[PDB]
Design a protein around this motif. Structure first.
Motif, PDB file in Angstrom:
ATOM      1  N   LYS A  55       0.824  -1.191   0.000  1.00 20.24           N
ATOM      2  CA  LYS A  55       0.000   0.000   0.000  1.00 20.24           C
ATOM      3  C   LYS A  55       0.864   1.248   0.000  1.00 20.24           C
ATOM      4  CE  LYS A  55      -4.268  -1.660   2.049  1.00 20.24           C
ATOM      5  NZ  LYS A  55      -5.241  -1.543   3.167  1.00 20.24           N
ATOM      6  N   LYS A  56       0.348   2.286  -0.648  1.00 19.88           N
ATOM      7  CA  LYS A  56       0.941   3.612  -0.624  1.00 19.88           C
ATOM      8  C   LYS A  56      -0.175   4.612  -0.394  1.00 19.88           C
ATOM      9  CE  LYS A  56       2.698   2.842  -4.702  1.00 19.88           C
ATOM     10  NZ  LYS A  56       3.457   3.086  -5.942  1.00 19.88           N
ATOM     11  N   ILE A  57      -0.053   5.383   0.681  1.00 21.46           N
ATOM     12  CA  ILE A  57      -1.130   6.217   1.190  1.00 21.46           C
ATOM     13  C   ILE A  57      -0.701   7.667   1.104  1.00 21.46           C
ATOM     14  CG2 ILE A  57      -2.659   6.715   3.133  1.00 21.46           C
ATOM     15  CD1 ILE A  57      -0.726   3.495   3.069  1.00 21.46           C
ATOM     16  N   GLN A  58      -1.651   8.526   0.770  1.00 20.25           N
ATOM     17  CA  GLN A  58      -1.421   9.957   0.814  1.00 20.25           C
ATOM     18  C   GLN A  58      -1.228  10.391   2.258  1.00 20.25           C
ATOM     19  OE1 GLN A  58      -4.494  12.147  -1.091  1.00 20.25           O
ATOM     20  NE2 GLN A  58      -3.374  14.083  -1.011  1.00 20.25           N
ATOM     21  N   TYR A  59      -0.037  10.902   2.559  1.00 17.77           N
ATOM     22  CA  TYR A  59       0.321  11.383   3.895  1.00 17.77           C
ATOM     23  C   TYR A  59       1.131  12.660   3.708  1.00 17.77           C
ATOM     24  CZ  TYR A  59       2.268  11.455   8.593  1.00 17.77           C
ATOM     25  OH  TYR A  59       2.635  11.815   9.864  1.00 17.77           O
ATOM     26  N   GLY A  60       0.434  13.779   3.586  1.00 18.30           N
ATOM     27  CA  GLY A  60       1.081  15.061   3.419  1.00 18.30           C
ATOM     28  C   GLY A  60       1.282  15.773   4.738  1.00 18.30           C
ATOM     29  N   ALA A  61       2.074  15.176   5.619  1.00 21.39           N
ATOM     30  CA  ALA A  61       2.208  15.662   6.981  1.00 21.39           C
ATOM     31  C   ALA A  61       3.623  15.368   7.460  1.00 21.39           C
ATOM     32  CB  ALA A  61       1.132  15.044   7.881  1.00 21.39           C
ATOM     33  N   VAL A  62       3.806  15.359   8.775  1.00 21.07           N
ATOM     34  CA  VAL A  62       5.115  15.391   9.403  1.00 21.07           C
ATOM     35  C   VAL A  62       5.326  14.107  10.187  1.00 21.07           C
ATOM     36  CG1 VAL A  62       6.561  16.617  11.017  1.00 21.07           C
ATOM     37  CG2 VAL A  62       5.071  17.896   9.554  1.00 21.07           C
ATOM     38  N   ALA A  63       6.579  13.674  10.244  1.00 22.06           N
ATOM     39  CA  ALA A  63       7.006  12.667  11.200  1.00 22.06           C
ATOM     40  C   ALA A  63       8.506  12.809  11.386  1.00 22.06           C
ATOM     41  CB  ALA A  63       6.647  11.260  10.743  1.00 22.06           C
ATOM     42  N   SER A  64       9.074  11.883  12.142  1.00 24.30           N
ATOM     43  CA  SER A  64      10.506  11.874  12.381  1.00 24.30           C
ATOM     44  C   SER A  64      11.211  11.282  11.166  1.00 24.30           C
ATOM     45  CB  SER A  64      10.817  11.114  13.663  1.00 24.30           C
ATOM     46  OG  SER A  64      10.481   9.748  13.537  1.00 24.30           O
ATOM     47  N   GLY A  65      12.497  10.998  11.316  1.00 25.57           N
ATOM     48  CA  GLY A  65      13.299  10.529  10.213  1.00 25.57           C
ATOM     49  C   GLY A  65      13.851  11.645   9.371  1.00 25.57           C
ATOM     50  N   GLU A  66      14.085  12.808   9.968  1.00 27.52           N
ATOM     51  CA  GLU A  66      14.510  13.983   9.233  1.00 27.52           C
ATOM     52  C   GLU A  66      15.423  14.799  10.125  1.00 27.52           C
ATOM     53  OE1 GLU A  66      11.157  16.172   7.909  1.00 27.52           O
ATOM     54  OE2 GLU A  66      10.358  14.536   6.679  1.00 27.52           O
ATOM     55  N   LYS A  67      16.283  15.585   9.486  1.00 26.24           N
ATOM     56  CA  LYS A  67      17.125  16.514  10.219  1.00 26.24           C
ATOM     57  C   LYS A  67      16.314  17.644  10.840  1.00 26.24           C
ATOM     58  CE  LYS A  67      21.228  18.137  11.316  1.00 26.24           C
ATOM     59  NZ  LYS A  67      22.131  17.453  12.253  1.00 26.24           N
ATOM     60  N   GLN A  68      15.096  17.873  10.350  1.00 25.91           N
ATOM     61  CA  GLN A  68      14.292  19.044  10.662  1.00 25.91           C
ATOM     62  C   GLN A  68      13.242  18.813  11.737  1.00 25.91           C
ATOM     63  OE1 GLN A  68      12.358  20.435   7.173  1.00 25.91           O
ATOM     64  NE2 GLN A  68      10.958  21.806   8.242  1.00 25.91           N
ATOM     65  N   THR A  69      12.805  17.567  11.934  1.00 22.28           N
ATOM     66  CA  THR A  69      11.561  17.287  12.648  1.00 22.28           C
ATOM     67  C   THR A  69      11.540  17.892  14.045  1.00 22.28           C
ATOM     68  OG1 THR A  69      10.080  15.523  13.363  1.00 22.28           O
ATOM     69  CG2 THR A  69      12.461  15.083  13.506  1.00 22.28           C
ATOM     70  N   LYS A  70      12.681  17.896  14.720  1.00 24.62           N
ATOM     71  CA  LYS A  70      12.710  18.216  16.139  1.00 24.62           C
ATOM     72  C   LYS A  70      12.483  19.703  16.375  1.00 24.62           C
ATOM     73  CE  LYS A  70      15.783  15.992  18.612  1.00 24.62           C
ATOM     74  NZ  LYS A  70      17.146  15.721  19.133  1.00 24.62           N
ATOM     75  N   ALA A  71      13.383  20.534  15.849  1.00 26.31           N
ATOM     76  CA  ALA A  71      13.270  21.969  16.049  1.00 26.31           C
ATOM     77  C   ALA A  71      12.002  22.505  15.414  1.00 26.31           C
ATOM     78  CB  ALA A  71      14.486  22.675  15.466  1.00 26.31           C
ATOM     79  N   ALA A  72      11.631  21.967  14.258  1.00 29.26           N
ATOM     80  CA  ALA A  72      10.451  22.462  13.571  1.00 29.26           C
ATOM     81  C   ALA A  72       9.177  22.113  14.326  1.00 29.26           C
ATOM     82  CB  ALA A  72      10.413  21.907  12.164  1.00 29.26           C
ATOM     83  N   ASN A  73       9.099  20.909  14.896  1.00 24.64           N
ATOM     84  CA  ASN A  73       7.955  20.588  15.738  1.00 24.64           C
ATOM     85  C   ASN A  73       7.919  21.489  16.956  1.00 24.64           C
ATOM     86  OD1 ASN A  73       6.622  18.524  14.281  1.00 24.64           O
ATOM     87  ND2 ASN A  73       8.068  16.981  15.025  1.00 24.64           N
ATOM     88  N   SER A  74       9.082  21.790  17.529  1.00 30.42           N
ATOM     89  CA  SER A  74       9.113  22.715  18.655  1.00 30.42           C
ATOM     90  C   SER A  74       8.581  24.085  18.256  1.00 30.42           C
ATOM     91  CB  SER A  74      10.533  22.819  19.194  1.00 30.42           C
ATOM     92  OG  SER A  74      10.950  21.594  19.758  1.00 30.42           O
ATOM     93  N   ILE A  75       9.000  24.579  17.092  1.00 29.49           N
ATOM     94  CA  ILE A  75       8.494  25.846  16.566  1.00 29.49           C
ATOM     95  C   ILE A  75       6.982  25.806  16.434  1.00 29.49           C
ATOM     96  CG2 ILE A  75       8.448  27.362  14.579  1.00 29.49           C
ATOM     97  CD1 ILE A  75      11.383  26.406  14.039  1.00 29.49           C
ATOM     98  N   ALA A  76       6.474  24.786  15.751  1.00 31.67           N
ATOM     99  CA  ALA A  76       5.055  24.757  15.430  1.00 31.67           C
ATOM    100  C   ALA A  76       4.206  24.599  16.682  1.00 31.67           C
ATOM    101  CB  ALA A  76       4.758  23.651  14.425  1.00 31.67           C
ATOM    102  N   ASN A  77       4.642  23.774  17.631  1.00 31.23           N
ATOM    103  CA  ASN A  77       3.915  23.653  18.887  1.00 31.23           C
ATOM    104  C   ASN A  77       3.958  24.953  19.681  1.00 31.23           C
ATOM    105  OD1 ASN A  77       5.151  20.448  18.670  1.00 31.23           O
ATOM    106  ND2 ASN A  77       2.956  20.754  18.977  1.00 31.23           N
ATOM    107  N   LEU A  78       5.092  25.656  19.650  1.00 28.53           N
ATOM    108  CA  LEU A  78       5.194  26.943  20.330  1.00 28.53           C
ATOM    109  C   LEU A  78       4.231  27.956  19.737  1.00 28.53           C
ATOM    110  CD1 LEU A  78       6.822  28.701  22.365  1.00 28.53           C
ATOM    111  CD2 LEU A  78       8.461  29.074  20.578  1.00 28.53           C
ATOM    112  N   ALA A  79       4.207  28.050  18.413  1.00 29.99           N
ATOM    113  CA  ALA A  79       3.290  28.959  17.747  1.00 29.99           C
ATOM    114  C   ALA A  79       1.848  28.583  18.023  1.00 29.99           C
ATOM    115  CB  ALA A  79       3.561  28.948  16.255  1.00 29.99           C
ATOM    116  N   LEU A  80       1.558  27.286  18.020  1.00 27.79           N
ATOM    117  CA  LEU A  80       0.207  26.815  18.269  1.00 27.79           C
ATOM    118  C   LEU A  80      -0.265  27.233  19.647  1.00 27.79           C
ATOM    119  CD1 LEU A  80      -2.123  25.087  17.291  1.00 27.79           C
ATOM    120  CD2 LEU A  80      -0.976  23.113  18.088  1.00 27.79           C
ATOM    121  N   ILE A  81       0.575  27.036  20.657  1.00 30.46           N
ATOM    122  CA  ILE A  81       0.157  27.362  22.012  1.00 30.46           C
ATOM    123  C   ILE A  81       0.084  28.872  22.202  1.00 30.46           C
ATOM    124  CG2 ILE A  81       2.478  27.191  22.991  1.00 30.46           C
ATOM    125  CD1 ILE A  81       1.075  25.916  25.443  1.00 30.46           C
ATOM    126  N   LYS A  82       0.999  29.627  21.585  1.00 26.52           N
ATOM    127  CA  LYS A  82       0.883  31.082  21.611  1.00 26.52           C
ATOM    128  C   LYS A  82      -0.415  31.553  20.981  1.00 26.52           C
ATOM    129  CE  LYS A  82       5.664  32.560  21.717  1.00 26.52           C
ATOM    130  NZ  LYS A  82       6.726  33.293  21.008  1.00 26.52           N
TER     131      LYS A  82
END
Lengths: 49, 72
Positions: free
Chosen positions: B1-28
């Motif tokens: 199977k191959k599923i449309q998943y236009g979203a975020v997960a780990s396995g990237e150089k970016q996931t950590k800091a970027a999730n921190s950014i987005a959660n910070l903005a969300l809570i603000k």
């Protein structure tokens, strides 16, 4: 000897008051921003640099 | 199977800091809506991956009902 009439009295009281025990819960209180916080001398504290 | 998943997960150089950014903005962004019904001063926000916490201080003393209503 029990005299019904002479034994009768009328007791007075206040009608329908309400007693509040805690007294500062109705007070809300806030502080100025502590950078601009001042002492007795109307002169800022923590100002020397 | 191959599923449309236009979203975020780990396995990237970016996931950590970027999730921190987005959660910070969300809570603000959310935390500026409780202000429609409460007066508080945001003292601290922290975000680390799989959790996040914000402390906030009031003009008065706390009750059960403010906790309940803030949570809802």
């Amino acid at each position: 000897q029990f005299d019904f009439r002479a034994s009768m009295h009328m007791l007075t009281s206040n009608l329908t008051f309400t007693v509040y025990s805690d007294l500062l819960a109705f007070v809300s209180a806030d502080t100025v921003e502590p950078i601009n916080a001042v002492a007795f001398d109307n002169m800022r504290i923590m100002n020397e640099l | 199977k191959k599923i449309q998943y236009g979203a975020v997960a780990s396995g990237e150089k970016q996931t950590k800091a970027a999730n921190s950014i987005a959660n910070l903005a969300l809570i603000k962004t959310v935390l500026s809506r409780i202000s429609n019904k409460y007066s508080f001063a945001t003292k601290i926000i922290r975000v680390d991956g799989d959790d996040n916490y914000a402390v906030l201080q009031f003009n008065t003393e706390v009750t059960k009902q403010m906790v309940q209503d803030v949570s809802n």
